[PDB]
Amino acid sequence: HHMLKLIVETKTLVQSLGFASSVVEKPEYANIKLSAKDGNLELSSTNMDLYLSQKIAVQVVSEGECTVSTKTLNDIVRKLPDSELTLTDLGTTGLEIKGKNCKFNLFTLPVSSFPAMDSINPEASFKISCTDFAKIIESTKFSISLDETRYNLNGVYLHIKDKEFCSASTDGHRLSISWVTLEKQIKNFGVILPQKSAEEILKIVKDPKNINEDIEILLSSNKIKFICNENTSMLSKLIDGTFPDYSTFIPESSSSKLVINRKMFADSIERIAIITVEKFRAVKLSLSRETLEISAVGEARGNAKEVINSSQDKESFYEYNSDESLAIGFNPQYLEDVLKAVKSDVVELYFSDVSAPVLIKFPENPKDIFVVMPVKV
């Protein structure tokens, strides 16, 4: 026989179904596999290039498996008011979800039609804190290319240089690099994790139940697997391409340096940028020792200017250690993405000429590097 029957804490099931449904976004056709075994409920969700397995502790009354519609199960569980639920596969009547006052019956689909997770012979595996992994993805997810005709830039480049595990991303206009030290020496490798995989594993490591724990990362030649805090494993395809050598993208020298309050800077850029039009996303930074003017123009819209004066005050800090003036343009979105990536009081910007990239560093955050090309203004 072996028919699934279990009692589960409702809140815990809701959380799991939330992760299961965001995984198959691209969804009336997506199914979730439920497996009750050894005191646990295992929920499996998968698409063309992702496989998510979540285990949660439940009262297993009878071992068994079945699959039902992800959306219908998620939608139903979110609306049940009891603290505990009973799930029971009753065969021809389907999977019964039972609260105190109501019963739902879901049609099931055969378990033989649901794929299991692929098996992997990992050439390399290591553990880092969920906090460290969250930072590296959050400092790099935003500068992935969205152009699908650039296959090798549509992910984050996860790679090892000596004992540092790094994420890099670029789209030709900016580069982001974030890294952490590893405990053990480990073989050099680099893989491009697809965007959707990066976003879903980011959401997993940020869960309050996991954020303070560890994530194990196991590598194979064509697949990457995350096991986040023992009970959640995600196995992801890799993007079939080669991430460019970014070493020449990082400026080796600078002619001038700006130190500025990050919040003040970011708020002013985004404010001045409002006047711009889609055809010309640019703000102009007119930098001098005494002031910075952020200005912008929008065709048939108007023009705008903000003045930031030099200041040694923390809330309004502005220092530009140069006798020369520099007027240089940037896409405001690309500055804003970097300024919002790191919670820092001040930010440093290293310039050369108006057509050379700016290197951006955050002084309390030495393992995060950002490079942003200018635009003609």
Binding site: G172, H173, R174, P244, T248, P357, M373, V375, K376
Partner: peptide, 10 residues
């Protein structure tokens, strides 16, 4: 809108 020295692509 100049690009980083990606080879190819810039």
């Amino acid at each position: 809108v100049p690009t980083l020295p990606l080879v190819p692509x810039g």
